[PDB]
Design an enzyme around this catalytic site. Structure first.
Site, PDB file in Angstrom:
ATOM      1  N   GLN A  99      43.728  41.489  38.730  1.00 55.05           N
ATOM      2  CA  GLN A  99      43.135  41.512  40.067  1.00 55.05           C
ATOM      3  C   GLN A  99      42.071  40.426  40.241  1.00 55.05           C
ATOM      4  O   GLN A  99      42.044  39.720  41.225  1.00 55.05           O
ATOM      5  CB  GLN A  99      42.511  42.877  40.350  1.00 55.05           C
TER       6      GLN A  99
ATOM      7  N   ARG B  44      49.909  49.770  32.746  1.00 53.84           N
ATOM      8  CA  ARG B  44      48.858  50.304  33.601  1.00 53.84           C
ATOM      9  C   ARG B  44      48.692  51.747  33.236  1.00 53.84           C
ATOM     10  O   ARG B  44      49.687  52.476  33.185  1.00 53.84           O
ATOM     11  CB  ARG B  44      49.253  50.215  35.070  1.00 53.84           C
TER      12      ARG B  44
ATOM     13  N   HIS C 239      40.403  45.639  35.217  1.00 54.34           N
ATOM     14  CA  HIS C 239      41.567  45.239  36.011  1.00 54.34           C
ATOM     15  C   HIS C 239      41.653  43.718  36.105  1.00 54.34           C
ATOM     16  O   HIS C 239      41.359  43.122  37.133  1.00 54.34           O
ATOM     17  CB  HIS C 239      41.409  45.853  37.411  1.00 54.34           C
TER      18      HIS C 239
ATOM     19  N   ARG D 246      48.058  38.099  43.875  1.00 44.05           N
ATOM     20  CA  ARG D 246      48.382  38.925  42.727  1.00 44.05           C
ATOM     21  C   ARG D 246      49.645  38.468  42.028  1.00 44.05           C
ATOM     22  O   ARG D 246      49.705  38.477  40.797  1.00 44.05           O
ATOM     23  CB  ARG D 246      48.593  40.361  43.122  1.00 44.05           C
TER      24      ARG D 246
ATOM     25  N   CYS E   1      40.552  44.829  47.140  1.00 43.15           N
ATOM     26  CA  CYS E   1      41.724  44.822  46.221  1.00 43.15           C
ATOM     27  C   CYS E   1      42.942  45.562  46.744  1.00 43.15           C
ATOM     28  O   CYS E   1      44.055  45.244  46.348  1.00 43.15           O
ATOM     29  CB  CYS E   1      41.377  45.345  44.808  1.00 43.15           C
TER      30      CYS E   1
ATOM     31  N   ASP F  61      35.893  48.338  47.609  1.00 40.72           N
ATOM     32  CA  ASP F  61      37.046  49.097  47.158  1.00 40.72           C
ATOM     33  C   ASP F  61      36.834  50.600  47.448  1.00 40.72           C
ATOM     34  O   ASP F  61      35.765  51.020  47.785  1.00 40.72           O
ATOM     35  CB  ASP F  61      37.211  48.927  45.663  1.00 40.72           C
TER      36      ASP F  61
END
Ligand SMILES: [Cl-]
Ligand SMILES: [Cl-]
Ligand SMILES: [Cl-]
Ligand SMILES: [Mg+2]
Lengths: 340, 334, 336
Positions: free
Chosen positions: C140, C110, C137, C322, C277, C235
């Site tokens: 996700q 990441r 991402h 996740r 998220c 988000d």
């Protein structure tokens, strides 16, 4: 065995957030279970009760003992751990504790938290949906006191906790002092808190502990008088006069005030007890081999602060046994609450 | 031998005999081969290890962690912050606490004296993952790498040169190591940066008993002539900015490892080694700065050498793990 | 069948590297691993595997998800967290990748630019998984798609419609658009025009969508964007590593795209569900969310407390997912 199974049943899936939440017999069970896990480990006989369990360890403040104790206890018991340190926690900055608790609860089987206010760990414990364990807050440090009590029993040649007397010297209003007092009251012990009045524990907490002690035959004394406070004691306990997260300015007013409560050989003598033992939760400032302890002791013309080198390294000192016992007792907490 | 290594510390190569070191290397080779064949037997099952890093180093850390995991151990990583170490608590106290909870302890940090105190007080094996004075695990890896790249030659038969700043942990350890194993080492660099004279003398005495040889020189051509391996390391200070590096660069520049230097060995099979990390191009932010400031693409070694067929730096890096594994297996393994 | 074989040893760097059927296979595999875990039946496919977790930015969900997934599957992990040095400051990613690739069987990253994780993926010699970059991402969106299927009573992805509100040009918006297109979904990106995804990416997604029967719409109009939606997604309006100054001129601009009960109402769908998220700024229980909301006299930013805590919200199911989807990624690519 004529031993009651009630306590094991009642501890399953509980949180371990403070000693006030538990009965005398639940605490004694945790201690007994610690001794059994300790013996099994020494014999190479340990049975894994946390196999396949995953645990999160949230540390918003620093730790050596508490973190290591949780990790080694978990590993011995077949669990795996994720350590989330101070620069890893998003909590209260980017994500609420309520949210965090619900997210961690979905991924982990158990969660340790060390941090700030008791209210935070209580919220975590209310929302996670799994056992949450308090590895230190501003107000309480329950796992430390379990360790202390196991250590006292081992070093007391057959005496039970109800029969033991001990004094805690210094700043009594800190998490350790509070937990020692709650603990002493629950187990029916005779505790003296010996320190300047301004640093006695919160009056509300004292009164709740006085009520508990009355039902258990325990006893609680607060005093500024060293000689009277320590007379007859089996154990003397102290801690660094300044807590984690407090500014270096806290040492300005505190030293001259705390100095007369230093644990030195003279204090051990005033117990009148040649078998007196010395305890300290650690870390300790007992000489100049610490950068902070060196500068502070020098600044105020001293050699060791809350305890002297001579006492710390004498045969009266049982601090390293006490430290080892952190792991065994934390192991008991996890095994009782999460173990199957 | 195996018996004699059980429960020892691994704090510096000076603490071991020629045959102990060779045993560690041999054990490394065996563990490497077993891992590659999917045949590895776990000797550290049920063991918990603490990894103390007072200064970060992701390479040494990764080698300890992978070695432990392969062998069935579990690890606690304690990095530069989040602990109580040096500052709130003495090493003596920390050692005695960790020794009660862990079966073994790695330390990477500052003075040798600190890791020696840890080793004296922990009550369990303690392993030195780097101190100011010595870096013993790196040299094991280097020696395994040399043997693997020498077509059956033994260490006693190998010749190698280390170029640059010899006055630090890797140079010290290469010299102690060369002396112990009966090797022919040349330290090639400015005189001011040769290793401590007291340590040279102790190594000279060792080398006599083993048939080894130690030469210190400022002359590149003579230092590298006939060498099987050339070794170097970063010679600027990481605690300093690229702005402070003018003096040290000009002084160290003539000891750069480039193709010419490889040529001066006279050996077409010469191999190049480096403990890493290395400043070999302008791809990094520090490499860009250096390229701008001193007109150099690469410092202690050039890109051409680093990426050439002569370079064995990534085999050498992989070997950190196999050797660290041998150390833990020999000292703690059941 | 074919898809399992084809996924072995692949990197997982962005959804644009996979076919429709590979993605569907990952999601299906996630659901199977989730069920096996819950039944005590899980078979460990990553036994003896060691995995490096490189985090150059902060994470709760993603880190935890990788760790739990690895542990359940018999792997061990090394977490390498954010420090003062980024890869590329003093050691190239090309060097780092080759060293880690010798020691580990798989690597998560990441961090910052997609170019960095692509370089890691090119040089490591082992599977590399993108746990979040500036651009994308992907893990996700797997989780999001599993969650939608679970909350859609037997509807397939191709049949679902959803809207993403706010800053659409962030990693999650971009990945939701790539994902919608691949799986034939009807996505609306609903936010100010200055924050729509890059035109080059939109056009690539439009071409993908055309052959899957998907649909992509961009609009500033909330009512029209959210009408008929099964799910609403949002988000935080400011991304990780943007300066705190970004808030100042972005809140007023974004405010009309807040998800509140009105917005849910405009869907016309009593069964509408809400997704995020996480982490989310939905009340005053964070220092950052309280300060920013207070500056504009608000209670909650991108979503309100009422919507976040309502029966419509499935954010905690989404979060749990996740882990199951990250597990599928590792098992497919590295699982023996
Ligand atoms: Cl308590
Ligand atoms: Cl050495
Ligand atoms: Cl993507
Ligand atoms: Mg063991």
């Amino acid at each position: 065995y004529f031993q009651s199974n009630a306590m094991a049943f009642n501890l399953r899936n509980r949180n371990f957030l403070k000693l006030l939440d538990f009965s005398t017999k639940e605490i004694q069970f945790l201690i007994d279970l610690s001794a059994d896990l300790k013996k099994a480990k020494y014999a190479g006989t340990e049975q894994k009760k946390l196999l396949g369990k995953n645990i999160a360890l949230i540390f918003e403040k620093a730790s050596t003992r508490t973190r290591c104790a949780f990790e080694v206890a978990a590993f011995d018991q077949g669990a795996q751990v994720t350590y989330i340190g101070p620069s890893g926690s998003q909590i209260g900055d980017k994500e609420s504790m309520k949210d965090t608790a619900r997210v961690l609860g979905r991924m982990y089987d158990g969660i340790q938290y060390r941090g700030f206010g008791q209210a935070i760990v209580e919220e975590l414990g209310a929302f996670a949906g799994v056992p949450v364990w308090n590895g230190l807050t501003d107000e309480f440090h329950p796992t430390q006191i379990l360790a202390d009590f196991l250590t006292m029993l081992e070093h007391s040649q057959g005496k039970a906790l109800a029969d033991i007397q001990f004094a805690y010297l210094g700043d009594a209003r800190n998490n350790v002092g509070n937990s020692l007092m709650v603990g002493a009251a629950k187990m029916g012990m005779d505790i003296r808190l010996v320190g300047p009045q301004a640093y006695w524990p919160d009056e509300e907490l004292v009164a709740a502990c006085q009520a508990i002690a009355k039902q258990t035959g325990g006893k609680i004394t607060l005093t500024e008088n060293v000689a009277e406070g320590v007379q007859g004691c089996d154990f003397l306990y102290t801690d660094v006069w300044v807590s984690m997260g407090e500014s270096p300015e806290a040492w300005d007013e505190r030293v001259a005030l705390m100095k007369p409560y230093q644990v030195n050989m003279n204090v051990l003598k005033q117990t009148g007890n040649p078998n007196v033992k010395f305890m300290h939760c650690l870390p300790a400032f007992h000489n100049d081999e610490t950068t902070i302890g060196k500068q502070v002791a020098d600044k105020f013309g001293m050699k060791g602060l809350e305890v002297t080198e001579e006492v710390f390294e004498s045969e009266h000192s049982i601090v390293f046994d006490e430290a080892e016992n952190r792991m065994h007792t934390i192991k008991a907490v996890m095994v009782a609450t999460l173990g199957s």
